[PDB]
Amino acid sequence: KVRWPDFNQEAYVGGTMVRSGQDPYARNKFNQVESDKLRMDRAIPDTRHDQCQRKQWRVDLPATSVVITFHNEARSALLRTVVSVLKKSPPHLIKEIILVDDYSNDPEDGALLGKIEKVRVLRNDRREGLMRSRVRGADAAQAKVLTFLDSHCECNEHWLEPLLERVAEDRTRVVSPIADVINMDNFQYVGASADLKGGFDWNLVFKWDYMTPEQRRSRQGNPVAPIKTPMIAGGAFVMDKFYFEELGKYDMMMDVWGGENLEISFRVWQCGGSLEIIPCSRVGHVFRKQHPYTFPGGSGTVFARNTRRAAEVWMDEYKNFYYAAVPSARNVPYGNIQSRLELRKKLSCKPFKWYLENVYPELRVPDHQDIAFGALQQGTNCLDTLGHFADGVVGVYECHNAGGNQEWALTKEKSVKHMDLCLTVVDRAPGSLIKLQGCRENDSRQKWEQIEGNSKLRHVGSNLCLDSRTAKSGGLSVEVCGPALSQQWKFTLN
Amino acid sequence: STTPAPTTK
Ligand SMILES: O=c1ccn([C@@H]2O[C@H](COP(=O)(O)OP(=O)(O)O)[C@@H](O)[C@H]2O)c(=O)[nH]1
Ligand SMILES: [Mn+2]
Numbered sequence: 184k185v186r187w188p189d190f191n192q193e194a195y196v197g198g199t200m201v202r203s204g205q206d207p208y209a210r211n212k213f214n215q216v217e218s219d220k221l222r223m224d225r226a227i228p229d230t231r232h233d234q235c236q237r238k239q240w241r242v243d244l245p246a247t248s249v250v251i252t253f254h255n256e257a258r259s260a261l262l263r264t265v266v267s268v269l270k271k272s273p274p275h276l277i278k279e280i281i282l283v284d285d286y287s288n289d290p291e292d293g294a295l296l297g298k299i300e301k302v303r304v305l306r307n308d309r310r311e312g313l314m315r316s317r318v319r320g321a322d323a324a325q326a327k328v329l330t331f332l333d334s335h336c337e338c339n340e341h342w343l344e345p346l347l348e349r350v351a352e353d354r355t356r357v358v359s360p361i362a363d364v365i366n367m368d369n370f371q372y373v374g375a376s377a378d379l380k381g382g383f384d385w386n387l388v389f390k391w392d393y394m395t396p397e398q399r400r401s402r403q404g405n406p407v408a409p410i411k412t413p414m415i416a417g418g419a420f421v422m423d424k425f426y427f428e429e430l431g432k433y434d435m436m437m438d439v440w441g442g443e444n445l446e447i448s449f450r451v452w453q454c455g456g457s458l459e460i461i462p463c464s465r466v467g468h469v470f471r472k473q474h475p476y477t478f479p480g481g482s483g484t485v486f487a488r489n490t491r492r493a494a495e496v497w498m499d500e501y502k503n504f505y506y507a508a509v510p511s512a513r514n515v516p517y518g519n520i521q522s523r524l525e526l527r528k529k530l531s532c533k534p535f536k537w538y539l540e541n542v543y544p545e546l547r548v549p550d551h552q553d554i555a556f557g558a559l560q561q562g563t564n565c566l567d568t569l570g571h572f573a574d575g576v577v578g579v580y581e582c583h584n585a586g587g588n589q590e591w592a593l594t595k596e597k598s599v600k601h602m603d604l605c606l607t608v609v610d611r612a613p614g615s616l617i618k619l620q621g622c623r624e625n626d627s628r629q630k631w632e633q634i635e636g637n638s639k640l641r642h643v644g645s646n647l648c649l650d651s652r653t654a655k656s657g658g659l660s661v662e663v664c665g666p667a668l669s670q671q672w673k674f675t676l677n
Numbered sequence: 678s679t680t681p682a683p684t685t686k
Contacts (some may be wrong), residue, residue, distance in 0.1 A: 230686070364682050375683040391683045416680055444680075470682035482678070 192223045196259045211257045212475040213367035218259040223266040229340045230374030234407045235463035240344035245327045250320030252283040253334035260335040267338040278326035286310040312439040318432045333418040339465035346421040354423040355456035359415045360464035372467045381414035385508040387490045410460040413543035417444035419466045431526045439478045442489030449497040452542045453532040491517035499535040555593045557677040565589040576658030597630045605629040616658045
């Protein structure tokens, strides 16, 4: 074993450098050339609030087992993660660093780091994904507190003590640092805004939420107080080890990446614990726009399946808004969830309604319209009743965005409806004026269909299209469908 | 597709 300053980073990183002409983003979807230029212990700016710097940390804190899983990580980024932990953490609080090599292409990426003081390397015999890889590390951990980090992170000054302090006081707090940004193109370390919380929209993709005016005002007494958060990112958090185990680890049927941070956030809040972001704790993370690795079965499929498993277990009736937002997820089998449903039951977890009202009151229920009401627009003109009733013609007029004569609905009956009147093809002879008549289910003259990417209206069972060319000489007509601006119509929602 | 970056300071 060597102390990390004696580790031969040049030999290690030199084995896998990008060659001349080669794409520096191909392997990792960040710039490996810029990662490889950095020293393993490169200095980073202290991004903490001034109030953090005047802090003495409770002394008798529990040591942690740091679990880092990785799959085909750049050697420079993985090493720099390990070193940031060893250099920026008090040694007596680092029991061990467990690297879980999740079936990387090259087993030396991990094996060579095994040389370093306090590093334990666990290589998976097959691809396991981050969830099962994290449970593997966590099951192997000897300490009383778990820390999970992604494999391209850089810990900052006194990042660890503020997290440990929270968990030492209350074992049911699951806590994360502010996620500073390591730029994926040039690897500069930049501080994140401290005014953020974790959240999601109904498509159940994690996002950062900006604090409301009132939330910020309430924090002026102490801007470094813990931020209670509806959701944590997955890349860095600290959790009491027994709490992790008792509360159900991670869902072992989740694969590769995605949705475990959603699942664990719901679980922790619904089953009586809490989530916090801790401003005095800062850890940089290389954010990316694409995953560099394979998803056995397809990245869309996998992510949807993982999310279904979380939604079906935690979200009660609210899961319906996810399927509404992501219809395609309905097509994705998700396997057996009994273990997880029973876990929820055993722990007497609270309903999702409880979470929305008490944890994430900012998330607004989606706004439902089974039917399209609005304008049928052609440039700056709108389909207009002209103020006519049954047997009158229709036309186009400057859009006034005031509904009225310019408000229509596209019915499931395949009609074009204003109140109880429908656009009626009284004569199929090309060039004929259409008329309003009372809507009847059984009037084939009143049936229209949107065609060409919802850009024209064709009369069902004909090759006739609604046409405005006759507007100045009597009103809208049916005309043979062809390339004419006068046959273009966009339904614009109210 | 991936965890998004927070807005910077
Ligand atoms: O099959 C996989 C996929 C991902 N990871 C690791 O899990 C973390 C989360 O993945 P990533 O950084 O790709 O996600 P992002 O942070 O972009 O959302 C990283 O340490 C990965 O190397 C893994 O061990 N196995
Ligand atoms: Mn990551």
